[PDB]
Design a protein around this ligand. Structure first.
Ligand SMILES: C[C@@H](C(=O)O)c1ccc(-c2cc(Cl)cc(Cl)c2)c(F)c1
Ligand SMILES: C[C@@H](C(=O)O)c1ccc(-c2cc(Cl)cc(Cl)c2)c(F)c1
Lengths: 116, 115, 115, 116
């Protein structure tokens, strides 16, 4: 599982459940091409986005749909989404965890990059 | 000053100085139209991006060129840039501060919306 | 102003107003000696805690009364308080800003050390 | 495992390994009594601090020894430690994860509180 997303909720002190995530890869023409999507589980984790074979070098954008998450809880948040944009696998295959911590007017994000 | 950007460095414990910041407004066709840009000051602040007259309701994107900032300090960073995307809504208070706190593999951002 | 505290609210997107802040200095016997205190302003800032003459090298603790802040807004918070503990070192720059960003179950803090 | 600590490193993009953690509980006399201690593993996680039986109601302080962590990497950091102080189990037993994200001049911390 080379690309995982984990999301926590800083208001409830809980995993952020049912957060939609869309991943894009920058194409040869410099547009954002849809790559994978999913939503976080009861643990706040999203597994199974991609495979080792399909997760090639490139510039990836992980869009975390924070506004849809907060609106679904009936909260009117500030941001449209949280975008995490990075070059992946340029030194060979790595495993990436994109972690995020959400509040209605703020988010934090970090990356955990490991070499299998 | 309806829109301000303030950038801090969590490695050095300092303002993030001479960071490039580009602001875009979402157009009718869903493209990002250049809106304003500048470099953060010695205090990590970028003032004077827009006026009340130009800053209408809509969706704005603040792109912070974090990758150049880290490489100029000799540090290998994770992100291509930091993007903050939000709706300006007359209704809420009228002054927007977008604040960001940078580390090589992480950033935090918050909004301070007042008056 | 050698020491400043700046508190922001990540739920409302605003300064954290009228937060109690207590500053202590570690004494020779490892106890915390009261040093300075105040409430954050309308801008979430607390200025004028100390002078250059009183602010000597040593270990300081900044205690932010986050629990009272949240309860006064009708919100149930996790922490008893937020504590920021650091050494003041003449060597490094001379002005310390302790900044905190508050949520009910979380906080972030950074230092901005300049001049 | 009712009390866990997880720590990430925002500079290296990695778990924060070998972080010492000391937990205190406020005693009847209002002093901080040592309760448990340990250090984070290769995953950045610290398990096995306490038991359900021993983790009674109280006010707990989780001290994360950030200065010792950064000095052991030869970095001179700002903070002495990161203290996380909270009331636990006042509505019955819960499971607490104290998560932290470290930089030399900054840290974030959040709590994940679940009901078994
Ligand atoms: C438990 C773990 C995961 O399951 O990958 C996870 C998920 C999110 C966070 C986290 C915590 C803080 Cl304090 C800040 C940020 Cl950006 C992420 C974290 F530290 C750890
Ligand atoms: C106003 C400015 C300062 O006074 O140095 C300031 C104060 C605090 C922050 C801030 C921002 C985030 Cl995103 C997280 C934290 Cl812990 C502090 C910031 F980005 C900028």
């Amino acid at each position: 599982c080379p690309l995982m997303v984990k999301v926590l909720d800083a208001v409830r002190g809980s995993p952020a459940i049912n957060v939609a995530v869309h991943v894009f890869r920058k194409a040869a023409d410099d547009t954002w091409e849809p790559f994978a999507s999913g939503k976080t589980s009861e643990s706040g984790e999203l597994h199974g986005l991609t495979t080792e074979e399909e997760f090639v070098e490139g510039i990836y954008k992980v869009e975390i749909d924070t506004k849809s998450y907060w609106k679904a809880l009936g909260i009117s948040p500030f941001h449209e989404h949280a975008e995490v944009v990075f070059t992946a696998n340029d030194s060979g295959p790595r495993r990436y965890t994109i972690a995020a911590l959400l509040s209605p007017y703020s988010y934090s994000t970090t990356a955990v990059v490991t070499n299998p």
